[PDB]
Amino acid sequence: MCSTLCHHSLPALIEGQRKYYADYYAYRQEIRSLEGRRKRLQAMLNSS
């Protein structure tokens, strides 16, 4: 069990960065859609 938890530590610690980095890039793309959708709304006031 010591050698288990030793191994579990080493394989898990690497998987987290990959988990996060994926969601990080997943978040970046979501921000873009947010960042543009505003502009179309902003341009409603220009026509008025």
* Cα 2 off chain centre by: 34
Give the nearest distance from C-beta 34 to another protein in angstroms: 5
> What residues numbered 5-24 form the site for another protein, per CB under 8 A?
5-9, 11-16, 18-20, 22-24
**Given CA atoms 10, 11, 17, 23 in this order, what sign does their dihedral have?**
negative
Give the nearest distance from C-beta 10 to another protein in angstroms: 10
Residues making contact with another protein (CB under 8 A): 1-9, 11-16, 18-20, 22-24, 26-27, 29-31, 33-34, 37-38, 40-41
